[PDB]
C-alpha cells in the first residue's frame, strides 16, 4: 500500500478529500501536515497473497546446510548448483512448487509451468 508518515511529528498520514481542486490530499491528524498523494490507492487487502512465498532470502542463504541442493538450470547464469526450498507461505492450501536461489547470482526462480 506504500504508506507514509509525517515528517514533522513522526505520525501517520491519512487521506483527505479536497473541494477547491477535488483531489486526494494526505494530511496529519495531530499537526495538520498537508501534502499531495502519489497514488489514489489508499488501502489494499490480499485474499490470496503471492508475495511472501520467497521471504527470508539472504545473500548467504547457501551457507545453510539443511537447505538442499539441486543442479537445475539457472536462467541467469546457466549454472548447475543452487539451493532449493518450498513455498514459505505456510497456508494449508499452497502448492508444493519449489523455489531456487543460485549461489552465484542470487536470482530466485521457481519450478512453475503455467507462469512461464
Amino acid at each position: 500500500t506504500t504508506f507514509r508518515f509525517c515528517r514533522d511529528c513522526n505520525n501517520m498520514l491519512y487521506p483527505r478529500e479536497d473541494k477547491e481542486n477535488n483531489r486526494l490530499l494526505f494530511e496529519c491528524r495531530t499537526c495538520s501536515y498537508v501534502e499531495e498523494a502519489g497514488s489514489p490507492l489508499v488501502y489494499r487487502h490480499e485474499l490470496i497473497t503471492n508475495i511472501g512465498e520467497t521471504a527470508g532470502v539472504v545473500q548467504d542463504i547457501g551457507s545453510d546446510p539443511t537447505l538442499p541442493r539441486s543442479d537445475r538450470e539457472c536462467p541467469k547464469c546457466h549454472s548447475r548448483e543452487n539451493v532449493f526450498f518450498q513455498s514459505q507461505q505456510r497456508r494449508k492450501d499452497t502448492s508444493m512448487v519449489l523455489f531456487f536461489v543460485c549461489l552465484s547470482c542470487s536470482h530466485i526462480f521457481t519450478s512453475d509451468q503455467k507462469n512461464k
Partner: protein, 98 residues
C-alpha cells in the same frame, strides 16, 4: 539416550563480553531502518543486540567453543531464514555428542 547429557548451567557474562568485543551492536541504539538485514542475538532468551555479519560471529563462537574457551555445554543456533542467533547456557538442556 546412552550418550545424552544434561547441561548444568554457566554464567553467561563471558559470552556477552565475547559478543560485545566481536562487534555486537548494542540494542539501545538499534534503529532497524538503517540496519534492516540484521541478525538478532539471543542469550538465554534475553534479546541482547544485533549483528551485521553473523557468519563470522558464528564461526568464531564455534572456534572458541571448540578450543575450550567457551564451555561446550553452551548451545548456539543460527536461524538464517529468520535471521536470528540464539545462545543457550542455562541448565536443563539435553544434548548429545557428535
Amino acid at each position: 539416550s546412552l550418550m545424552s547429557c544434561i547441561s548444568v548451567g554457566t554464567d553467561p557474562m563471558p559470552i556477552i563480553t565475547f559478543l560485545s568485543e566481536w562487534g555486537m551492536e548494542p540494542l539501545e541504539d538499534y534503529v532497524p531502518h538503517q540496519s534492516p538485514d540484521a541478525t538478532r542475538v539471543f542469550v538465554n532468551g534475553v534479546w541482547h543486540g544485533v549483528h551485521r555479519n553473523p557468519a563470522r560471529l558464528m564461526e568464531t563462537l564455534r572456534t572458541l567453543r571448540r578450543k575450550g574457551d567457551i564451555n561446550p555445554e553452551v548451545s548456539m543456533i543460527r536461524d538464517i531464514r529468520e535471521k536470528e542467533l540464539k545462545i543457550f547456557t542455562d541448565a536443563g538442556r539435553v544434548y548429545r555428542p557428535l
